[PDB]
């Protein structure tokens, strides 16, 4: 017989994880939460088969009500004993079972409280529809689960004695009775799982265009024909920030990214573009990161001091002092095929910097702690904000002098954007006018060419394209690299940092991202020139005192 499952959805209200009360146990209800841990899909004993131990005849299709049960009927006439059975696992019938742990959303968390978690069980077709690091709405029944944890808690815990009033007894001689504790914790059994976007508001393009309706395809293609599409995109990135067009260009290219290539040797070429923003205090560097985490899907925002090496990559966790160990995904795993925004990168200690650059080269995270040996994917881009030594950016020193990050950190960043604070009357006047206008006017002081929804739609469309270099593109790229090297050779110490082969690879990656921005399958020499110009004005000239 087939097992049928009814999934209910579109409940009128969704309840917060802290609104769960004991009155709703056994009732259909909807919750929302962030998936932090997911388990292996496991078989659950739905309809077991037993054999009576002394009858030794087979029986089947005995329903299981949560915890494991044994029948006491035994319709075989051979026995007179009900309790003694054995269970065979082969003839039994099983079901999909997955336990996924969800957490309170950030906006749902009260004023001083810590986030609290909930274990929700998925069965049947609903399994594997929840992924770590996304916001999911679960519709299901609030169930109750036995819990031995509550033994030391204050208060009277309910117990369960067997009642002995209709049992005749004799004091013949030769007084023991069994009592069990009724201690429970609230869990959820979800029949329906839907994944809300982690943002505030599938590689093949043919799959993606089929999901969109024809009308929305019409505005998508309408954005495609626009000859000034690049200018609209770079102005639509972070409208709260005034100025800084180069950083917006780099952030747009980071959201687009490059293609991932592998040689015949087996080495992998990274398509992710890493951006680092360094400069004087209060130059809106954190505004870029807050815009990216609120806008880009599969993006996390971390602080350098508040992070940890296990919290950034992956952690092996002891649960309830039980012999099992688990893995919870760190920040870079939650931002896989996304952007990890690390604010205050200079404040991160050296051990976490080592543990994160291991993922920066290897694109993977190795776990060998205790009995767990695993390799995990860390294909994530990094958007970092750093402060120079002493607060202000020193014009006299180089880029390596200002930054406390290691050379393995510094070499893998494709772009370094140094934002300097200079006091000019005009630029300060329009900047102050813009900021006070924001404070006065709220949303309507923000006027991007594209809304956030259509910008995400265009980026998701553009990520499907895989640009390839042309014959003229390779020659122009080689000549541009030679010009970069000759410029550093003439500059000597006036350059912030010297061009190596890695900057040529970053220029290739940026040209691929620019070709993705214009939705073309072939890279134009003009796109390579634009990537060259972006990387060129990324580097600033070091001032030298007169002799």
């Amino acid at each position: 017989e087939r097992v049928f499952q009814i999934s209910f959805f579109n409940l009128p209200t969704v309840h917060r994880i802290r609104d769960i009360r004991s009155e709703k146990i056994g009732s259909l209800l909807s919750i929302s939460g962030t998936v932090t841990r997911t388990s292996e899909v496991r078989p659950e004993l739905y309809k077991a088969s037993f054999t009576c131990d002394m009858c030794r005849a087979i029986v089947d299709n005995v329903e299981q009500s949560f915890k494991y049960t044994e029948p006491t009927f035994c319709p075989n006439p051979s026995c007179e004993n009900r309790a003694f059975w054995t269970l065979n696992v082969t003839r039994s019938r099983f079901l999909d079972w997955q336990k996924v742990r969800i957490q309170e959303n950030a906006n749902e968390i009260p004023t001083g409280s810590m986030p609290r978690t909930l274990d929700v069980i998925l069965r049947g077709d609903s399994v594997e529809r929840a992924k770590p690091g996304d916001r999911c709405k679960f519709t299901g029944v609030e169930i109750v689960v036995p819990d031995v944890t509550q033994l030391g808690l204050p208060g009277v815990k309910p117990s369960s004695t067997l009642d002995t009033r209709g049992i005749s007894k004799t004091t013949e001689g030769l007084r023991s009775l069994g009592v069990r504790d009724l201690t429970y914790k609230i869990s959820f059994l979800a029949c329906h799982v839907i994944s809300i976007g982690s943002n505030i508001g599938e590689r093949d393009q043919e799959v993606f265009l089929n999901s969109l309706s024809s009308d929305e395809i019409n505005e998508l293609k309408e954005m495609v024909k626009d000859e000034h599409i690049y200018d609209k995109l770079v102005r639509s990135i972070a409208p709260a920030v005034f100025g800084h067009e180069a950083v917006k260009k780099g952030i747009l290219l980071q959201m687009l990214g490059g293609v991932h290539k592998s040689t015949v040797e087996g080495i992998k070429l990274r398509g992710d573009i890493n951006i680092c923003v360094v400069g004087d205090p209060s130059t809106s560097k954190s505004q870029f990161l807050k815009y990216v985490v609120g806008f880009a899907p599969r993006s996390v925002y971390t602080s350098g001091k508040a992070s940890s090496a296990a919290g950034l990559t992956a952690a092996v966790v002891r649960d309830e002092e039980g012999g099992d160990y688990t893995i919870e995904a760190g920040a870079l795993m939650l931002a896989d095929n996304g952007i990890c925004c690390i604010d205050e990168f200079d404040k991160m200690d050296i051990s976490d910097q080592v543990a994160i650059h291991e993922a920066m080269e290897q694109q993977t995270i190795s776990i060998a702690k205790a009995g767990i040996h695993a390799t995990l994917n860390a294909r994530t881009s990094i958007l970092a904000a750093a402060n120079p030594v002493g607060g202000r950016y020193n014009r006299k020193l180089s880029l390596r002098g200002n930054l406390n990050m290691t050379a393995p950190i510094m070499s893998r960043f494709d772009l370094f954007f140094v934002i300097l604070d200079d006091c000019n009357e005009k630029i300060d006047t329009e900047l102050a006018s813009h900021i006070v206008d924001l404070h006065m006017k709220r949303d309507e002081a923000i006027e991007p060419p594209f809304s956030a929804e259509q910008l995400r739609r265009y980026i998701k469309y553009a990520r499907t394209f895989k640009p390839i270099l042309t014959k003229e593109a390779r020659s122009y790229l080689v000549e541009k690299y030679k010009e970069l090297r000759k410029d550093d050779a003439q500059g000597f110490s006036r350059s912030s940092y010297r061009i190596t082969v890695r900057q040529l690879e970053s220029m290739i990656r940026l040209s691929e991202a620019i070709a993705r921005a214009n939705c073309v399958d072939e890279i134009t020499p003009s796109f390579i020139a634009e990537a060259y110009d972006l990387l060129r004005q990324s580097i600033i000239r070091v001032d030298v005192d007169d002799v």
């Binding site: 997911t38 292996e40 078989p43 079901l95 599969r298 099992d324 390799t375 294909r379 090297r485 082969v501």
Partner: protein, 628 residues
């Protein structure tokens, strides 16, 4: 019965259908017929040849293709796919009988034949296993992470009665569940029976953790893992860290009282591996003749150096140093008292972006025993030996570190300048006396650390300075710099012509690497290098003496002329050691004058490149005869 009658089923499920005795003997007869008569219409029976080969090599494994059984007996292939345990037991008995017909006394020697099903058509990932796959045959891909030790599992269990003392006849042990005994046949009692391991027969058992390969994993999701049980012939075939395809029965673990943490009757699952297929420096007699043929050529050394690191462009001196380090010299203990190191230590000191890491990775792929270690990073084998207690197992292990583990091999150290004090002492001891002394946790011992070392380092400040000499450019103290034989200083001076070819090489690699789009091949070179390290042992004769003392005396006084750091005896020994590696590339039992001159060239070039700019210009004209 017949095949069409086998397709029709009378029992409730396929397992009870095959379990019926008439159906079982019909299946056995049809499988024996299929094993005997099957041909590919080429006049040859593949299975008869396989049976003869396994009989001649004394093997208990018969590799049976699934497509061959599917095209001939489709219902038997379906029965094997859906109910593989009893089907494999029946066809194991069938193959045992087929081997018995070929060899009559094979039964007393082995008494068991395991059939390995090959080329199962459907391929599952670890994340898509469900309960419908339970008690069925599944083929999954994965990377092995860890494996246990080989354990003895009971196969033919023999008991003894405590009342009588008699030994009761053997019983076959099912791998799924424990077997027990209740009757004595000598005492006619249900008394306590004990297993004696002396008369009990065992099979090998291993557990292997298999995870989904990280390339196949979807982006946001975590890689799933399974436990795979390997039986007697299948133990220790899969090294952890390698990717394999395993075909086996997907089944449930039975545990007492299920899982109390979940609150649900949840079962753990395993794969009982029927077969393991993998997705070696052994040379044949023809390969040795081909090695002699290619080593007879005059430009063998040039061709070997050009074959070094094909992804690396333009660094010929580094590739030469790598060739010397990979081939190695002859370590010599003269009359027991005096010992001379015979492996080349190479230090690549270079500015960032000079592709030293790719060279180290190439050596790791190329060398027989190459251990990668890093001073800065953490996810690597440590350089210091230790005795450590497992926090779970509570059992101590002695690890020699990367230097001891690379004994008779290669140790590749990245970020040489970023070590701590303990690692610096460890590599100092390893390059000093080729051993590591440990006195920890009651263990006092010395481990052999005769490892060649190839290291990569960066200059101070991120850039090499020509006016300063080599000692000022690194944090490395002079004694650890003296232990290196070849000192490759690499600086990326901006030359437009060099940058043009380098950029062209990088862009051509990028274009060919796109998914939408003279040199010895490496498989032959690897075995050539392994053969040379173990077969040649080049020597030199007494009449070649009058030249080396001639050049070395012309060396030292020139070092007196400019006041640089001196030419010591270590430079002469490096000359005599590198020359014994050039004679290994030629596969020559003697060291010629040309190999000696090339070694002199390498040592002099490494010495001059280490100098300051003032010393280098004077040293270049005086040794232009040796450098050529």
């Amino acid at each position: 019965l017949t095949l069409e009658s086998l397709s029709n089923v009378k029992a409730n499920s396929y397992s009870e259908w095959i379990t019926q005795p008439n159906v079982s003997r019909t299946i056995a007869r049809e499988l024996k017929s299929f094993l005997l008569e099957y041909t590919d219409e080429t006049g040859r029976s593949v299975y008869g040849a396989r049976i003869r080969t396994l009989g001649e090599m004394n093997s208990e494994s018969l590799e049976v293709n699934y497509r061959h059984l599917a095209e001939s007996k489709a219902i038997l292939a379906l029965f094997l796919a859906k109910c593989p345990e009893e089907m494999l037991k029946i066809f194991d008995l069938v193959a045992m009988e087929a081997t018995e017909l070929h060899y009559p006394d094979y039964a007393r020697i082995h008494s068991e034949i395991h059939v390995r099903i090959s080329d199962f058509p459907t391929i599952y990932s670890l994340r898509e296993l469900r309960e419908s796959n339970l008690s069925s045959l599944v083929r999954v891909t994965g990377v092995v992470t860890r494996r246990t030790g080989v354990f003895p599992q009971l196969k033919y269990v023999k008991f003894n009665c405590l009342k009588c003392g008699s030994i009761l006849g053997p019983f076959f042990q099912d791998s799924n569940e424990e077997i027990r005994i209740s009757f004595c046949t000598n005492c006619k009692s249900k008394g306590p029976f004990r297993v004696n391991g002396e008369k009990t027969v065992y099979r090998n058992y291993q557990r292997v953790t298999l995870q989904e390969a990280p390339g196949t994993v979807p982006p946001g999701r975590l890689p799933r893992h399974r436990e795979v049980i390997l039986l007697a012939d299948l133990v220790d075939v899969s090294k952890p860290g390698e990717e394999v395809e395993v075909t086996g029965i997907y089944k449930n673990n039975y545990d007492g009282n299920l899982n109390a943490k979940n609150g649900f009757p949840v079962f753990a699952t395993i794969i009982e591996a029927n077969s393991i297929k993998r997705r070696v420096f052994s040379w044949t007699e023809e390969e040795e003749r081909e090695f002699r043929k290619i080593s007879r050529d005059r430009g063998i050394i040039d061709k070997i150096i050009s074959s070094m690191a094909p992804s690396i462009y333009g660094h010929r001196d580094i590739k030469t140093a790598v060739a010397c380090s990979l081939f190695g010299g002859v370590p010599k203990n003269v009359n027991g008292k005096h010992s001379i190191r015979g492996d080349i230590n190479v230090l690549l000191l270079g500015d960032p972006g000079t592709a030293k890491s790719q060279i180290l990775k190439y050596v790791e792929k190329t060398a027989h025993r190459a251990v990668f270690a890093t001073g800065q990073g953490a996810s690597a084998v440590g350089l210091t030996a230790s005795v450590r207690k497992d926090p779970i197992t509570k059992e101590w292990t002695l690890e020699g570190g990367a230097l001891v583990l690379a004994d008779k091999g290669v140790c590749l150290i990245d970020e040489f300048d970023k070590m701590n004090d303990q690692d610096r002492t460890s590599i100092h001891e390893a390059m000093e006396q080729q051993s590591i002394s440990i006195s920890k946790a009651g263990i006092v011992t010395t481990l052999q650390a005769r490892c060649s070392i190839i290291a990569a380092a960066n200059p101070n400040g991120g850039r090499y300075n020509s006016t300063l000499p080599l000692a000022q450019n690194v944090s490395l103290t002079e004694p650890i710099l003296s232990r290196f034989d070849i000192l490759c200083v690499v600086r990326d001076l901006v030359d437009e012509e060099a940058d043009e070819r380098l950029a062209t090489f990088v862009v051509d690699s990028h274009v060919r690497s796109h998914p939408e789009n003279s040199p010895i091949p490496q498989e032959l070179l690897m075995k050539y290098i392994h053969y040379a390290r173990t077969k040649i042992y080049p020597k030199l004769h007494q009449m070649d003496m009058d030249k080396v003392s001639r050049v070395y005396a012309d060396l030292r006084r020139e070092s007196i002329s400019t006041g640089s750091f001196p030419i010591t005896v270590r430079h002469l020994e490096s000359i005599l050691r590198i020359a014994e590696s050039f004679a290994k590339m030629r596969l020559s039992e003697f060291v010629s004058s040309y190999d000696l001159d090339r070694a002199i060239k390498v040592v002099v070039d490494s010495f001059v490149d280490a100098q300051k700019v003032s010393v280098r210009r004077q040293l270049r004209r005086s040794f232009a005869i040796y450098t050529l």
